[PDB]
Write an enzyme that holds these catalytic residues in place. Structure first.
Site, PDB file in Angstrom:
ATOM      1  N   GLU A   1      36.730  97.168 -88.121  1.00 45.79           N
ATOM      2  CA  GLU A   1      37.089  95.855 -88.152  1.00 45.79           C
ATOM      3  C   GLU A   1      38.221  95.669 -86.977  1.00 45.79           C
ATOM      4  OE1 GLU A   1      40.115  94.251 -89.071  1.00 45.79           O
ATOM      5  OE2 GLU A   1      39.655  92.225 -89.074  1.00 45.79           O
TER       6      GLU A   1
ATOM      7  N   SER B   1      30.564  56.936 -75.689  1.00 43.37           N
ATOM      8  CA  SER B   1      30.653  56.195 -76.930  1.00 43.37           C
ATOM      9  C   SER B   1      30.438  57.225 -78.371  1.00 43.37           C
ATOM     10  CB  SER B   1      29.274  55.465 -77.294  1.00 43.37           C
ATOM     11  OG  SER B   1      29.476  54.674 -78.719  1.00 43.37           O
TER      12      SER B   1
ATOM     13  N   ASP C   1      16.289  76.614-101.510  1.00 43.00           N
ATOM     14  CA  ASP C   1      16.193  76.780-100.124  1.00 43.00           C
ATOM     15  C   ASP C   1      16.679  75.910 -99.224  1.00 43.00           C
ATOM     16  OD1 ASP C   1      14.942  79.102-100.499  1.00 43.00           O
ATOM     17  OD2 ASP C   1      12.923  78.653 -99.824  1.00 43.00           O
TER      18      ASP C   1
ATOM     19  N   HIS D   1      27.645  77.863 -84.333  1.00 43.18           N
ATOM     20  CA  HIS D   1      27.813  76.596 -85.282  1.00 43.18           C
ATOM     21  C   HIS D   1      28.366  75.453 -84.330  1.00 43.18           C
ATOM     22  CE1 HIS D   1      28.997  74.929 -89.205  1.00 43.18           C
ATOM     23  NE2 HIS D   1      28.411  76.164 -89.737  1.00 43.18           N
TER      24      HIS D   1
END
Ligand SMILES: *[C@@H]1O[C@H](CO)[C@@H](O[C@@H]2O[C@H](CO)[C@@H](O[C@@H]3O[C@H](CO)[C@@H](O)[C@H](O[C@H]4O[C@H](CO)[C@@H](O)[C@H](O)[C@@H]4O)[C@@H]3O)[C@H](O)[C@H]2NC(C)=O)[C@H](O)[C@H]1NC(C)=O
Ligand SMILES: *[C@@H]1O[C@H](CO)[C@@H](O[C@@H]2O[C@H](CO)[C@@H](O[C@@H]3O[C@H](CO)[C@@H](O)[C@H](O[C@H]4O[C@H](CO)[C@@H](O)[C@H](O)[C@@H]4O)[C@@H]3O)[C@H](O)[C@H]2NC(C)=O)[C@H](O)[C@H]1NC(C)=O
Ligand SMILES: *[C@@H]1O[C@H](CO)[C@@H](O[C@@H]2O[C@H](CO)[C@@H](O[C@@H]3O[C@H](CO)[C@@H](O)[C@H](O)[C@@H]3O)[C@H](O)[C@H]2NC(C)=O)[C@H](O)[C@H]1NC(C)=O
Ligand SMILES: *[C@@H]1O[C@H](CO)[C@@H](O[C@@H]2O[C@H](CO)[C@@H](O[C@@H]3O[C@H](CO)[C@@H](O)[C@H](O)[C@@H]3O)[C@H](O)[C@H]2NC(C)=O)[C@H](O)[C@H]1NC(C)=O
Ligand SMILES: *[C@@H]1O[C@H](CO)[C@@H](O[C@@H]2O[C@H](CO)[C@@H](O)[C@H](O)[C@H]2NC(C)=O)[C@H](O)[C@H]1NC(C)=O
Ligand SMILES: *[C@@H]1O[C@H](CO)[C@@H](O[C@@H]2O[C@H](CO)[C@@H](O)[C@H](O)[C@H]2NC(C)=O)[C@H](O)[C@H]1NC(C)=O
Ligand SMILES: *[C@@H]1O[C@H](CO)[C@@H](O[C@@H]2O[C@H](CO)[C@@H](O)[C@H](O)[C@H]2NC(C)=O)[C@H](O)[C@H]1NC(C)=O
Ligand SMILES: *[C@@H]1O[C@H](CO)[C@@H](O[C@@H]2O[C@H](CO)[C@@H](O)[C@H](O)[C@H]2NC(C)=O)[C@H](O)[C@H]1NC(C)=O
Ligand SMILES: *[C@@H]1O[C@H](CO)[C@@H](O[C@@H]2O[C@H](CO)[C@@H](O)[C@H](O)[C@H]2NC(C)=O)[C@H](O)[C@H]1NC(C)=O
Ligand SMILES: *[C@@H]1O[C@H](CO)[C@@H](O[C@@H]2O[C@H](CO)[C@@H](O)[C@H](O)[C@H]2NC(C)=O)[C@H](O)[C@H]1NC(C)=O
Ligand code: NAG
Ligand code: NAG
Ligand code: NAG
Ligand code: NAG
Ligand code: CA
Ligand code: CA
Ligand code: CL
Ligand code: CL
Ligand code: ZN
Ligand code: ZN
Ligand code: ZN
Ligand code: ZN
EC number: 3.4.17.21
Lengths: 690, 690
Positions: B370, B571, B606, B629
């Protein structure tokens, strides 16, 4: 009982004939009012037929049309600049349609505008190898030339890309009777051959799966942000126009320069097939001039989406889809397919009215703008990608039901091989001389597989149709089936011509509509089993078998370069190891599937469903981000053909010409790694889950 | 009963203390033999504890280490080239560890080698805005200078990237007592403050989610094809080294040139904090010279993966993961987390031995490397991406259990807000003065949310820990929790220092191990509910609420440029419309979830599980393909901080300085479109499925 036999028996040849007639009386060009009207009709009829919901999904996409007041044409022009020969402004319309309006004249959709003038070079089929032969062997430079190529062998987009990379300043496509006139058959209307005034329409994009050129990745909805034209995906940079063989003869007959390099370059017209450049001595100051004035315009398109909700697994989708837009009447392409879908919907709706529902949801689609680059199917899939990703069991295509009357053709994922074999053994052969025999038996007899005695040929999926987004982008198990010709002896002669009519089909292809009915039973049967079988009807072991065949094939290609394989330590061990593992794991999964509770059942069906999915690499293939399937992509040289382990294949292609062999062999090794990893990773999706 | 209360009651503070002691007696640097030994111990103990299977998953990844025989250091060098001042070769070891070997000396992991010599410029925290201030306002050019920056505010990788883009030829990082010495607290060993010889280790990569620099996209397995170093992901191009504040003082005290622009640039040492460049008159021919000799080397790493198979949904995975590699002893980071995981496994194993299993599968992970860039978690996730994609319910991180002793900190997806609120209301507060009160009550009281009275603060996920691949690459609902400090009054002073010991924790942070126990109950409780609740414990309506807050926020940023919004027709209507739709659809889904059969239950679970998934864009964010994401990415200026609608935020950032405003506002509109589409598309995953 409401079983497959009930579904199958309700299908009627006579209904398919009526629907085909109905769909082919006027043109249904994408983005035109008539194709919108037909969309509305299909929506209303699918509702009457009993579907639970039927909606239009519209998008605003880039389309291409000729200019009605400034016609496209090609000339031979003399040194004074007089136009001494002009190609035709339209195809002579067939008998009884000479007053139909709105027949779009032949053109190459998405051609830029221009009036380039120059010397011709004849490039045979304009394949990658045709250009190799010209540049490397014959020493003929296409730069600044107008190239003339015969249609056939490969997708016309590939031809145009290849001409462009060779420096051409324009491309003329023509239909040679060698490829579009079958011996002993009469020209339309007296037979099914292409007349000399006939012309094949078609788009010339190189989209590589993108969909609408302006909106790659995202649906072309009302707020979409569009690329500017200069950043659009896939547009050609030189003008292109298609002609028939009467006009081609006039352009080819004066050609001089080098002789054809061999007989595989000569078609059937009475001309030498000289490569050029330019015309012979007398005519050497004459030139060829194109006049192209077509415009690209963002235009609304309409898919029809019908839903028949599943009784037990409504969140699992079995899709039957095919397009509705045509170049002119669409007698074969696509309405022979759309009529078959219409009767399938009708039959499913009959059962539904009597209280039946399929286990899983069935989605029915009438796609728009297929002819302009698979645009309708691709925009809707981009829109619904998440739903399709997580819920998509299978996609069954349904374009043209016939391209011949000889036997069945199936192209599909290996996951459907066993389903197709089993279903066809239960269907009756429509073929003369196999009365009382199964379709399996006639098909196997006429089209034997090269691998295995007593089994039929089933091809890999290529592209150039609406399953592309579903299979190669999203990794949804996909298939297609149609009646085809004998391929001992390019596609049907009247393809994308004004002569592709109802009468063509009724008089010459399928007067009894029995081939249509057989194809409805195959496509409809597939859907029925996919949507109703308790255990999904996929056999993962069939994938294991082809994966080994493809690994052998790619290895054998590399092994043409033994010295480089030694120098660069190029090993296929990992790929073979992954294939071996996939074979073992698949076999163990099959035993559990046989020997195993609805959660356990759903787990195993999810493993079956996600198996095609597992071959997707989210990083895509090099420079083709929308071709994500590692096992299958359209050939980089021919969008109609499928290629196996495409990443490795392309890294090996023409590798002996690369200037930095270390770099090029490096990339072969990288692709080996990606392929081995992906195979292993797919295998592991079939291991016990915990 | 085997219920959550049984699980929770079996956790013991005394076991966590014993485990922490056990894990912190020697260093466990990634890629070293001792960390492999500890991996083997954890594997063997997780088996004894009762897990169904416990495996090591290894990878060969790029790591970085100093050269033992050629130490890194910095000098002030005079015009004769004599080294008149040298920084330290190591941190003075703490009491009783003065004979421990294998303490890695302070270094910046992945620094290239070099001995650059030059004039210093002081760049405060080396944030984007610090460089703006220097270049745009103070007119100070960093090109060819050595920059000295204080640690704090942002991830050190961002600092180094920013220095590089400013033209620096090297970077010196130091800990200023202003950021790492709390007022009235003694230096270690007599308190928890950083002594002047103390130094913060840490990597300086900019991986943007890639994992192993050599193998982006694919696991670093035995046959992996590795990029060459020059094409590796994320490596710095200039040398970098960290120092303590005794040595920093010696480097800063002679600085001349411009005064600091204001007091936010002055730390607490007795120096002027002059920006430079270079030293004052007397010392102006002296210079600073770095000597960096560290090497990057592909090294094997080991994750431990434990499985507790689910009784009903074994194909659904709830993951508790945290890392095991440390910079030195890892007293806090990570062993205070790993000890808590170890006791959670023990407790789950107790129930399991008495015949209980969770509904869903629980996976337990001890990640390696890590500290060197989230390498262990990322390689394993790349390897298993398909399984995780289709089966991953949630990921609960488990690094450091404490960074203070004041209250709870939770950072998580909105999908876990309701779960966290409910769970914490059932847990006892460990805080002085809230005896007999719930953890919710103490937490809410000490850390109130800025939005809502009577609720606690819960932050967005940032990055710089092992949930990154799971959340921002794969879209698996994720969370983390730990005890923290009061943030009225940078991280804990001894962070990544040799002084981060067992004694630090036992004497100063948590002598009773009650904060550890509270964090074990929170992390373990979360896992328990995720893995055992019949209906997944996610509330989609919480997402609707934050999506509106983020849309308001991004709109308000754009509205700083009203004229450009008019000129370019910018917009946010579509985004607000999508948010509105998500709100309505979410609310209807919640009613069905309340008012609705295991297939129906699995369908709705699900939909819950795939909801986080739906915010993933497979094309990624611009130039950061592993941040997929759309709602959350690590800040492009600070990997520790999360940013909402990152695509739009970055398109707006500093937009008034772009030279082609049309192009820049175009890209803002494009990102608005992508965000609105993604929100709508996620909403539609919660509609009735057919
Ligand atoms: C097909 O499935 C099989 C499983 O049945 C799977 O076999 C695995 O192969 C890997 C890759 O070869 C093996 O990796 C080894 O693991 C051991 C520890 O268990 C290591 O010590 C080994 O490393 C040493 O030796 C190497 C080889 O010379 C050196 O390069 C290295 O520096 C070390 O000295 C090595 O990493 C693995 O153990 C087996 N796994 C099992 C379960 O047997 C195979 O990889 C699958 N194929 C693919 C393509 O995935
Ligand atoms: C949030 O959900 C709502 C559904 O409740 C959804 O509303 C939809 O908005 C779209 C986009 O505005 C509407 O699109 C219209 O569809 C009709 C046909 O039904 C068309 O005729 C319209 O096009 C004409 O008018 C346009 C607007 O001025 C012109 O630009 C155009 O050239 C045509 O003249 C138009 O495409 C759609 O009908 C509704 N859908 C429903 C079910 O009401 C909204 O879009 C969702 N928000 C997001 C971000 O998805
Ligand atoms: C295509 O049809 C073939 C032939 O029917 C199907 O294969 C058969 O599938 C059945 C049903 O699972 C198998 O039956 C099983 O036999 C085993 C032991 O032999 C037993 O353990 C099970 O309980 C069950 O009775 C049968 O063996 C199998 N036959 C062959 C030759 O494989 C095949 O499944 C069909 N394919 C599809 C996609 O439907
Ligand atoms: C956190 O705990 C809260 C408070 O208990 C949970 O909300 C509650 O959930 C229950 C169980 O679904 C809801 O009960 C239902 O009431 C409706 C009508 O009011 C009825 O139709 C159902 O059959 C059922 O009895 C209850 O309303 C609801 N309370 C509130 C205030 O929302 C919440 O679900 C928990 N969150 C998680 C993630 O577990
Ligand atoms: C194709 O078939 C349809 C439906 O049978 C015909 O459209 C119908 O026309 C009738 C009579 O004009 C109208 O009253 C209906 O409203 C139409 N129905 C629908 C559902 O659109 C259509 O005319 C046929 N087209 C041709 C060329 O034969
Ligand atoms: C189609 O071609 C026509 C005919 O030559 C184009 O119309 C001309 O455009 C020019 C310049 O814009 C005008 O000054 C002429 O008056 C137009 N001619 C006529 C007959 O109206 C027309 O622009 C082209 N259409 C499209 C869509 O490109
Ligand atoms: C080919 O078409 C062109 C364009 O219609 C013809 O050339 C035109 O002829 C008219 C009438 O003679 C002239 O006023 C135009 O100026 C010409 N245009 C151009 C661009 O040359 C030409 O006659 C036709 N050629 C043949 C052999 O039919
Ligand atoms: C950390 O704890 C473990 C396990 O309790 C200790 O490792 C064990 O040591 C004993 C006695 O030397 C051996 O017989 C066992 O084989 C070891 N077990 C395992 C599972 O590894 C370890 O010594 C402790 N470490 C320290 C520093 O206290
Ligand atoms: C670590 O630094 C040492 C010490 O200065 C390096 O070892 C020298 O390398 C050179 C050239 O390769 C040799 O001629 C010397 O004899 C070596 N010195 C010693 C003391 O052995 C060593 O290469 C560096 N280590 C690494 C991993 O880079
Ligand atoms: C800082 O460290 C350097 C390197 O160890 C010292 O300079 C060395 O001193 C030795 C002995 O005097 C010489 O033989 C080396 O040639 C020197 N090396 C270099 C690179 O200059 C220096 O004395 C130390 N400085 C201080 C103030 O302690
Ligand atoms: C083809 O011709 C063009 C221009 O006449 C030239 O720039 C290019 O090099 C040529 N290539 C050859 C002869 O290989
Ligand atoms: C239909 O089949 C016959 C019999 O083989 C063949 O001669 C004819 O060419 C076929 N028609 C078409 C369009 O292929
Ligand atoms: C910073 O300095 C370098 C070289 O001395 C120069 O190339 C660069 O333009 C400078 N930029 C400035 C002063 O803005
Ligand atoms: C523990 O809490 C006390 C009481 O507020 C505080 O003074 C001390 O600073 C805390 N210890 C640590 C390491 O934060
Ligand atoms: Ca699109
Ligand atoms: Ca990797
Ligand atoms: Cl088809
Ligand atoms: Cl954490
Ligand atoms: Zn078609
Ligand atoms: Zn077509
Ligand atoms: Zn950590
Ligand atoms: Zn750390």
């Amino acid at each position: 009982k409401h079983n497959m036999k009930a579904f199958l028996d309700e299908l009627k040849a006579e209904n398919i004939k009526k629907f085909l007639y109905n769909f082919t009386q006027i043109p249904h060009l994408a983005g035109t009012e008539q194709n919108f009207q037909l969309a509305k009709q299909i929506q209303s009829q699918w509702k009457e037929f009993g579907l639970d919901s039927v909606e239009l999904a519209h998008y605003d996409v880039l389309l291409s049309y000729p200019n009605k007041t400034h016609p496209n044409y090609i000339s031979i022009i003399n040194e004074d600049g007089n136009e001494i020969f002009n190609t035709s402004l339209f195809e002579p319309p067939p008998p009884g349609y000479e007053n139909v309006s709105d027949i779009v004249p032949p053109f190459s959709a998405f051609s830029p505008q221009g009036m380039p003038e120059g010397d011709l070079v004849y490039v045979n089929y304009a394949r990658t190898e045709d250009f190799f032969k010209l540049e490397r062997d014959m020493k003929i430079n296409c730069s600044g030339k107008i190239v003339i190529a015969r249609y056939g062998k490969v997708f016309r987009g590939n031809k145009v890309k290849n001409a462009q990379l060779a420096g051409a300043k324009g491309v003329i496509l023509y239909s040679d009777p060698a490829d579009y006139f079958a011996p002993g058959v009469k020209s339309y209307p007296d037979g099914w051959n292409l007349p000399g005034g006939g012309v094949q329409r078609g788009n010339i994009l190189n989209l590589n799966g993108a969909g609408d050129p302006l909106t790659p990745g995202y649906p072309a909805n009302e707020y979409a942000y569009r690329r500017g034209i200069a950043e659009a995906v896939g547009l050609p940079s030189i003008p292109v126009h298609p002609i028939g063989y009467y006009d081609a003869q006039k352009l080819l007959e004066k050609m001089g320069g080098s002789a054809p390099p061999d007989s595989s370059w000569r078609g059937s017209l009475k001309v030498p097939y000289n490569v050029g450049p330019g015309f012979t001595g007398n005519f050497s100051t004459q030139k060829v001039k194109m006049h192209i004035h077509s415009t690209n315009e963002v235009t609304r398109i309409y898919n029809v989406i019908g839903t028949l909700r599943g009784a037990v697994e409504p969140d699992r989708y079995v899709i039957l889809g095919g397009h509705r837009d045509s170049w002119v009447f669409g007698g074969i392409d696509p309405q022979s397919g759309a009529a078959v879908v219409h009767e399938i919907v009708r039959s499913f709706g009959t059962l539904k009215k009597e209280g039946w529902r399929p286990r899983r949801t069935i989605l029915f689609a009438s796609w728009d703008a297929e002819e302009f680059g698979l645009l309708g199917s691709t925009e809707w899939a981009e829109e619904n990608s998440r739903l399709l990703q997580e819920r998509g069991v299978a996609y069954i295509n349904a374009d043209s039901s016939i391209e011949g009357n000889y036997t069945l053709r199936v192209d599909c994922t290996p996951l459907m091989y066993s389903l197709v074999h089993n279903l066809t053994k239960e269907l009756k052969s429509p073929d003369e001389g196999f009365e009382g025999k199964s379709l399996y038996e006639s098909w196997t007899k006429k089209s034997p597989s090269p691998e295995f005695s007593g089994m039929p040929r089933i091809s890999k999926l290529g592209s150039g149709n609406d399953f592309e987004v579903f299979f190669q982008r999203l990794g949804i198990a996909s298939g297609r089936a149609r009646y085809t010709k004998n391929w001992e002896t390019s596609g049907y002669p009247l393809y994308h011509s004004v002569y592709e009519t109802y009468e063509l089909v009724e008089k010459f292809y399928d007067p009894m509509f029995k081939y249509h009915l057989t194809v409805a039973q195959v496509r409809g049967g597939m859907v029925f089993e996919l949507a109703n079988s308790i255990v999904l009807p996929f056999d993962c072991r069939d994938y294991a078998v082809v994966l080994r065949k493809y690994a052998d094939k790619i290895y054998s290609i590399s092994m043409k370069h033994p010295q480089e394989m030694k120098t660069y330590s190029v090993s296929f061990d990992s790929l073979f190891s992954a294939v071996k593992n996939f074979t073992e794991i698949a076999s163990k999964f099959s035993e559990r599937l046989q020997d195993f509770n609805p959660i356990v059942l759903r787990m195993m069906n999810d493993q079956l469903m996600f198996l095609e999915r597992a071959f997707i690499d989210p990083l895509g293939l090099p420079d083709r981000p929308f071709y994500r399937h590692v096992i299958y992509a359209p050939s980089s040289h021919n969008k109609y053909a499928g290629e196996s382990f495409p990443g490795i294949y392309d890294a090996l292609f023409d590798i002996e010409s690369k200037v930095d062999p270390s770099k090029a062999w490096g990339e072969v090794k990288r692709q080996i790694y990606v392929a081995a990893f992906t195979v292993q990773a797919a295998a592991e999706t079939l291991s016990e889950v915990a």
